[PDB]
Amino acid sequence: KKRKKKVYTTPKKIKHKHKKVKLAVLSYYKVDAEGKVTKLRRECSNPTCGAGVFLANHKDRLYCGKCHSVYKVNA
């Protein structure tokens, strides 16, 4: 038995590098002149999600990020 090279009919596949956000945490909370802060992304209604899980925005729904549920803005 003599082996052979594995043919590549397609170019190489590149593993995705994570989108390293730079201080995007500063863009999830908004403070007023008195410093009163308010969340900008909604929270997950499932108990095991977190008080700052900050459901990711999308085109026509709301994806959690951790609990991997689906939310609708107008429900």
Partner RNA sequence: ACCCACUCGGCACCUUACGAGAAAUCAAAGUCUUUGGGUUCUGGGGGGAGUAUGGUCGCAAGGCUGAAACUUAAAGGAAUUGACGGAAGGGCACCACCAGGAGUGGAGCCUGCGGCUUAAUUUGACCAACACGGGGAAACUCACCAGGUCCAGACACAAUAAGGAUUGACAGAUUGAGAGCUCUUUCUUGAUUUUGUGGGUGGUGGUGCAUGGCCGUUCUUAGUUGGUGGAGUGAUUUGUCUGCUUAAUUGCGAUAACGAACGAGACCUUAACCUACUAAAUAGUGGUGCUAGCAUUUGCUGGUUAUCCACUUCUUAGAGGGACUAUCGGUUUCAAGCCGAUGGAAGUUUGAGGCAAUAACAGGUCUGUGAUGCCCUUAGACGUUCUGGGCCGCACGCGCGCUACACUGACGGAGCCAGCGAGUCUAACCUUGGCCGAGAGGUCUUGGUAAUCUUGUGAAACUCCGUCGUGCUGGGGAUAGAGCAUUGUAAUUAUUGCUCUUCAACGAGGAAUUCCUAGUAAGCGCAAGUCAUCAGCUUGCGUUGAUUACGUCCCUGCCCUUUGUACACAC
Give the binding site for RNA (CB under 7 A).
1, 3-4, 6-25, 27-28, 41, 50, 52-59, 61, 63-66, 68, 70
Closest to RNA by CB, 18 vs 36, is: 18
| Residue 63 bridge partners (DSSP) | 56, 70
Closest to RNA by CB, 36 vs 68, is: 68
What's the min distance (Å) between Cβ of 37 and RNA? 15
- CA 11 vs CA 8, 48, 50: distances in Å: 7, 42, 42
